[model samples]
Target: GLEAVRKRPGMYIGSTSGEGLHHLVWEIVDNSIDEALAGFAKSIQVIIEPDDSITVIDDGRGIPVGIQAKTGRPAVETVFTVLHGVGSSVVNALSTSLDVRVYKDGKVYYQEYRRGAVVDDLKVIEETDRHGTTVHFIPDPEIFTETTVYDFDKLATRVRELAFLNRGLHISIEDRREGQEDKKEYHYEGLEH
Candidate 1:
């Protein structure tokens, strides 16, 4: 509703400009981290592609593929569409939109959705011995009417901070923007910073 966005866009996103734009990326990365925390994922790589598309890849189990008991729909769809509803937890409600690709036991599965509606069901994309997931998304421009552009420096700083916080994971930031000559990676092991 207009009231929600007007009164608390910043509350949901923490800002109205560049930082907020970066939050979308952060949210996706955090979700992947959550999967890692749950022992479902190993590593995550984020790419800021041309035309502002963001890709997050994780070597973790894909999102749950079962029906949501409350909504009677795929949990992935529920996450992408429902607002202010808890999926696996009731205490801390969160909103999410995701595209999931699952690799399990030498098989590949794919699912896609928009606004909680199933655009496609899980299907085999390829056969592989790998077991993990990958999610690629372009933020909805409509939702971010204020801004859709991302700041590279801002994203680099955030990635660095995450690497520091994790204290062993390797986080690399690659700015593939046209005419950019700077490429950086952050990995700290057995060192204090």
Candidate 2:
């Protein structure tokens, strides 16, 4: 349950230190990486916003937005609201708020959550030719009381390393924070002799 994670954040995430703050980004990226590993994803983008929230975007088969039979709610809603173990659930519960936008079948579906609870049910926001998922979230100051700051180099170097390991997968990182604006793309065709 979400309450369990809140009570023992350290157990689920290591520590509330800057390390744990960075770990949240990795957990979300892992999902995107999994999609790439399965050949459904070709690109992933990570961004640090001015407010310090993080967004992870992936061009993979969008997460199912249809109704989930058991919960009688959208599958995407069920994933973050009730699921456990994976980073999505952990990230959701630890975040102050999260907004998910899914582009699939020419429609853009959206949902919002706060402190792991559903803020509203899923609904279509607009039309789109895109097929992918984007998750933007703010770390809960209540939970991450130590610090919510993120290091660009810490995230960039790791993302670059993953691109090399995955090969052909295009991954990018950008900082939209004031005076720290920078962007870079990592794509490796193959290992050189």
Candidate 3:
């Protein structure tokens, strides 16, 4: 993701004539969709987070951890299924506010953030058998929202084309901003030829 932003930053997003500007946001999302093209990704959720942060979430993969010899954190933190990330809780109690629940090794745990920090005592949400992770943040709403927001059609038009072109590539775009709710999904089974 970083490489593309540095190298073909222009082409990856689009033309370089004041074009890759607003498109940078979607390019950020475009990279995420590429992960789905890995052949197993089924769905992706592109949400213009209430805070104006472009959120690209897809149940593509998870991390799995059952070994030791590294940082110890999150009772629910075990292994990730499909992602390379930084597992840091130091930011949890430091950031504004965060809520996290991870399921690992058949054990489930949940944590809450208050006044910007976590102690050690976490609650048990439930036990299913898989692990999950979520790291959310506010985009300083002030400096963030001052930019271009959502263009459901900007994406709908593209995602629709992607779905039909790739056939196996399934993607959806939903915008619930401005006290409104709208959605456009493209999940074609391909040109059945």
The digit string of per-residue lDDT tens for model 3 on 1-193 reads 2223233433433443323333533533443455466554566666655543444555444223333456464332322111122212222222244454444556555555532345344566787554333333322222223333556677678778777766766677777677766877778775574
- Candidate 1 lDDT over 131-162, as tens digits, reads 77666665555556766766778888888898
Winning model by lDDT: 2
Give me the runs in candidate 2 sitting further than 4 Å from their true place.
191-193
Ranking by lDDT: 2, 1, 3
Q: Which has the higher lDDT value, candidate number 2 or candidate number 3?
A: 2
lDDT of 2 by residue, 1-193 (tens): 8878877889989998899999999989998999898899999999999999999999999889988778788889877877562779888899999999999999999999999888887999999999999999999989999999999999999999999989989999999999989999999996662
The weakest ten consecutive residues by lDDT in model 1 span 87-96
Q: Pick the candidate with the highest TM-score.
A: 2
Instruction: Report per-prediction Cα RMSD to one decimal.
Output: 5.0, 1.7, 7.9
For candidate 2, which ten residues in a row score worst on lDDT? 78-87
**Candidate 2 overall lDDT versus native:** 0.91
In model 1, residue pairs whose N, Cα or C atoms come closer than 3 Å (at least 3 residues apart or on different chains), thus clashing, are 40-61, 41-60
Candidate 3 residue-wise lDDT at 24: 38
lDDT, residue 59, candidate 2: 92
Report lDDT per candidate.
0.62, 0.91, 0.46
The model with the greater TM-score, 1 or 2, is 2
Superposition error at 187 for model 1 (Å): 2.0
